[PDB]
Every structure is written in C-alpha cells, then in structure tokens.
C-alpha cells in the first residue's frame, strides 16, 4: 500500500528529527543503521517529503558548519507528533477492547 | 487531520471484520462500545469506506430473524493485514534502534 510506505517513511523521518536536527546524508545513514541495511531511503523522496513538511510548517531548515543544510522539528512539529501518537494510542485501545469484547 | 482519521477508521473496521463477519449496524455498535462512546460511526461513512474496500477486494458482502447484509474480510484482506501489521512492527523496531543508536 504505497500510501502506507508514505506514512511509515514519514513516521521514521519525524522520529529522526525529534532525536535532533539533521541533514539528509545523516538521516539516510542513521535509518540504514537502525534498519540493519534493509531500508535505504532515496534523496529525491527525502527532498520531496521534506518540502511538504516545511510547506506545512512541521519542520524548518537551516544552514550549519562543513556547511550543510540542517532540518529541525518545529513546535507545531512536536505538537502534531504528540496528537498523532495519542490518537493512535486510542486506536490501539479500541482494537484491544474489540478483541477482549470478542472472548466475552 | 482527516487523512489520519480516515486511516484510523479503516484500521478499526478492518480489525472488527478480523474478529468476525458483521453487518453495518453491528459494526457501529461494537465500535461505540470498544470506544466507550467516543467513536460513533454513522452508516454513510461505513458504506463509503466499504465501497472502496470491496472494489479493492479487501472485503466482500453476502446476505444473512431479519435479513442483514454481512461483510467479510477476504483472503487478500487477511494477507494485507499481516503484511501491514508486520511492516509496522519493522518500523517500531527501527525507531527503537534509532533511539538506541542515539545513546550508544
Ligand atoms: C505512532 O503511531 C503512528 C503515528 C502516526 C501515524 C501512524 C501511526 C501508526 O501507528 C500507524 C499504524 O500503527 C498503522 C498504520 C498507520 O498508517 C499508522 C500511522 O499512519 C496503517 C494501518 O492503519 C493499516 C493496517 O492500514 C495499521 C498500522 O497499525 C498497526 C498498529 C496498530 N495499533 C494495530 O495493531 C494495527 C493492526 O497495526
């Protein structure tokens, strides 16, 4: 489900930045390690995805020394991630009740 | 965030059918109870989603002391749920390794 890799990739990316600001080569690098080599994200997509988020104010960009472009999570970024994790937590619960309410 | 509520609703409906075949009013009830009244789905929304899923072969329908239309998860349905649940566990792990690679 190609809309789902979109989300999965977005989730992982968001988590990398919540760790701390980072640049694309560093981001692809960290992800490939944490996935023990199974996931190589492509620049075009990271550059592609990163445009949407800054467009929506979830992340912002800044140049740091040696000079590479760095990306950081904004507050609306931190907030929207919190709402995401919490809503999805309620979903976990709804589903768990369904399973439990099943056995009864 | 309406792209995420739609995604969440699809998970729940799919997980209801994974519990067992059911009709629309039956589904709304089970969801209302598992969410202690927080997620009250209306008919129209389920018909909308079920039309898409049936078109994509994820679910099918058949007739069941009153006559009800029942919906069922197809064989392809279960398989996508396994691939989905699995791809999503892989993501969880990746994120733990990112956090692990952080401290380490
Ligand atoms: C931090 O959580 C998130 C934060 C932002 C976006 C997301 C998620 C998220 O957790 C998430 C998912 O867990 C799943 C999906 C998803 O899109 C997201 C996000 O977008 C896709 C999925 O909806 C399917 C089958 O289509 C199910 C899958 O849930 C997993 C875990 C569920 N609790 C449940 O067990 C389900 C069966 O598989």
Can you describe this structure?
The structure is a homodimer of 104-residue chains. Chain A has a single domain (2-74), classed as Arc Repressor Mutant, subunit A, CATH 1.10.10. Helices cover 68% and strands 12% of the residues of chain A. Chain A has four helices and two strands; from the N terminus they run H-H-H-E-E-H. The first copy, chain A, has helices at residues 2-19, 24-34, 43-55, 75-103, and strands at 59-64, 68-73. The termini of chain A are far apart. The A-B interface holds A 1, 4-5, 7-8, 11-12, 15-16, 19, 30-31, 33-36, 38-39, 80, 83-84, 87-88, 90-91, 93-95, 97-99, 101-102 and B 1, 4-5, 7-8, 11-12, 15-16, 19-20, 30-31, 33-35, 38-39, 80, 84, 87-88, 90-91, 94-102. The complex binds daunomycin (DM1).
Observed structural traits:
homodimer, 104 residues, mainly alpha, Arc Repressor Mutant, subunit A, binds daunomycin, dna binding protein
Structural class of chain A: mainly alpha
Which ligands appear in the coordinates?
A: daunomycin
- Shape descriptor of chain A reads elongated
Helix content of chain A: 55-70%
What is the CATH superfamily of chain A?
A: Winged helix-like DNA-binding domain superfamily/Winged helix DNA-binding domain
Task: Determine the most extensive contact between two protein chains.
Answer: A-B, 33 and 33 residues
